[PDB]
Write a protein that binds this ligand. Structure first.
Ligand SMILES: [Mg+2]
Ligand SMILES: [Mg+2]
Ligand SMILES: [Mn+2]
Ligand SMILES: [Mn+2]
Ligand SMILES: [Mn+2]
Ligand SMILES: [Mn+2]
Lengths: 296, 296
């Protein structure tokens, strides 16, 4: 049994447990047309302060900078792991990313953000994210080991963390102020699907660690740690930018930073590595409603 | 404007009209778990003749030989036409083919046809189909002209013709005898999506004819006609095989042949070529109910 070995016949499956990720993404299926964003537009116009409007503007630009794009990694995974069950999951995930793109493209239009988004790659903090996401993928085609590192970084640090500070910010407006219910619904649906995407990569990692332990060298983990540090520093910079004009009365920048730092620790621990950030349990209690909503 | 030219920015779309095929396939979305097949299994065991059982067995094997496979052409289209709107349609189409695969894999298992399907290449007519489908694709990466020929043959023949004799056969049991209602519903839903798939390819053909006329040489059309004839001969052989133990009391082989010969003529006319076959109006009237059902 090897993930890298092509298999022509559909059945019997070699990795039947992976099909649960296809079942999961079918259950999570959603389209933005299931929500009416009229109340969100009203909220953006007259129910928030200028400080809050600046936060929401930059948070939605940051979400869209990932979601409003062509995302083909999961759809292409079969080229590296040529298994029928890999294509079943990867192609279903790619379609889910089309649905996400349509949702956030619609929201950019409705919030009047198209012009700002056209220039989004101008913001220094966005450039920092682009830098690490490009670094994550740069060598994916060089070797099996380099591909596996790209897969791990994408699954555990992009899919499970990059957008989550923005997801928490947007859903916090609904939790604390009963505002932006439509965007809260779209963000919740998106979060659940990104959780599924990253968990697929975690399963692949555990399989790969058993099948080809020689890929997982000291050098592999040292580079992974360096890349994860670059990613966290960039997502902190995104938070500094989002809150540059003032913080929210109901959710501080530090609390959001603590939330994603805990997710970096969790990803490192999932990989077998040590956690490195000192987490506030009190601030985690402040945001734990989000994890209960997304995962329960 | 050129389909071969990469575009990075999502909006504005260069080919916004192609997004209607994404809308269409979202509207047609279905899973086989929406249907109860228990009545169909009982029908297969107890409510049909030995002649009818042979027809259904081979017809379901023939549908499955295409549908129960790894089908990546639409997902890979972006590699050749690197447009966001192409990925939107192609990725959504690929996911629809995963749903088709799951439906017919389920029906193979429920009808006890797994072992027959494992040996489906023993059948001469199936080998004839494999041969033309391989011929359609084997040069797709040699040149732009070869890729477009593969795209045209896949669109106008594999998606619009290959399975449709089998779709008509399966839905005819419900139409004339109120049997196999579950499979009728699944085949109807499959037919609607294959219609959408082929229509997308037709739209691409018309665009390419205008943008890239240098591809559509006398030699291109000569090779197209040769491949189309090879494919139609093979689908006639599939029909001969499906009915070789006897024809149905309510639907003759000639009537089904006439139906697909008309579709074949129509694909040729769509391409600007002459129709090949004389078509019986009376037999077309016998199967008109099917086109009404699919096109509603
Ligand atoms: Mg909920
Ligand atoms: Mg109907
Ligand atoms: Mn997404
Ligand atoms: Mn994702
Ligand atoms: Mn299909
Ligand atoms: Mn199709």
């Amino acid at each position: 049994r090897s993930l890298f070995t092509p298999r022509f016949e559909i059945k019997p499956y070699e990795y039947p447990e992976l099909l649960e990720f296809k079942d999961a993404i079918r259950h999570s299926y959603w389209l933005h047309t299931e929500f009416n964003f009229t109340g969100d537009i009203q909220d953006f116009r007259t129910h928030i302060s200028d400080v809050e409007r600046a936060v929401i503007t930059k948070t939605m630009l940051a979400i869209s900078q990932i979601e409003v794009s062509v995302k083909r990694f999961w759809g292409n995974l079969y080229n590296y792991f040529p298994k029928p069950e890999i294509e079943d999951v990867g192609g279903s995930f790619l379609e889910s990313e089309i649905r996400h793109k349509d949702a956030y493209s619609f929201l950019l239009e409705k919030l009047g953000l198209n012009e700002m988004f056209r220039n989004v790659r101008q913001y220094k903090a966005i450039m920092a994210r682009i830098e690490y996401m490009e670094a994550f993928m740069r060598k994916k085609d060089v070797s099996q080991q380099d591909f596996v590192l790209s897969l791990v970084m994408f699954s555990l640090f992009v899919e499970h963390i990059s957008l989550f500070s923005q997801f928490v910010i947007m859903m916090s407006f609904n939790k604390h102020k009963n505002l932006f219910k439509g965007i809260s619904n779209a963000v919740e649906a998106t979060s659940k699907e990104e959780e599924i995407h990253g968990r697929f990569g975690i399963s692949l990692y555990h399989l790969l660690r058993e099948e080809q332990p020689e890929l997982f060298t000291d050098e592999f983990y040292a580079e992974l740690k360096e890349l994860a540090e670059q990613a966290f520093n960039a997502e902190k910079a995104i938070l500094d930018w989002i809150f540059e004009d003032g913080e929210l009365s109901f959710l501080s920048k530090a609390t959001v930073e603590n939330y994603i730092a805990n997710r970096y620790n969790n990803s490192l621990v999932t990989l077998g590595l040590e956690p490195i950030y000192n987490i506030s349990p009190a601030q985690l209690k402040e945001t734990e409603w989000f994890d209960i909503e997304i995962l329960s």
